[PDB]
Each structure stands twice: as C-alpha cells, then as structure tokens.
C-alpha cells in the first residue's frame, strides 16, 4: 500500500520490511 | 496518514519528524 | 502524491527521484 507517516520523534527513518526503521541502526 | 513524494532534485531523502530530509545529513 | 511501498526484501531503502533506492549504496 501507499507510504504511511514515520515516528514524530525527531529521529531520521528509512523504509524496511513494510516499516520504518531508525537510519542510524544502519549506520 | 499517506505522505507526500519526497523533493525530486535527484537527491536521497528520509523522513523525520513530519518533513524529508537529506540522507547526506547523516552520513 | 502518495509514495508506493518499497521493496519487501528486507533491505532499507531511502527515497530518491520517485524510486526506492538501497541504503547500503550510499555508506
């Protein structure tokens, strides 16, 4: 389905797996 | 709800806080 | 308007020109 909205928390998020996932833990 | 497409500069984007925003930022 | 879901491989993706693009290129 369409991109839904990410966390409001002030963090950067990236797309995986149906979610999204906290940049930094790829990082 | 369904965000907008990110800017189409030919940049890579992710999503923080309600807004994209550079992936250079981070990395 | 709204942004298809990305790939479901389980890799992360970042949002880039109207495509889901890796992650893992831009490290």
């Given at each position: 389905?369409?991109?839904?909205?990410?966390?409001?928390?002030?963090?950067?998020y990236?797309?995986?797996?149906?979610?999204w996932?906290?940049?930094?833990?790829?990082?």
């Amino acid at each position: 389905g369409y991109i839904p909205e990410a966390p409001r928390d002030x963090q950067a998020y990236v797309r995986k797996x149906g979610e999204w996932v906290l940049l930094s833990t790829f990082l």
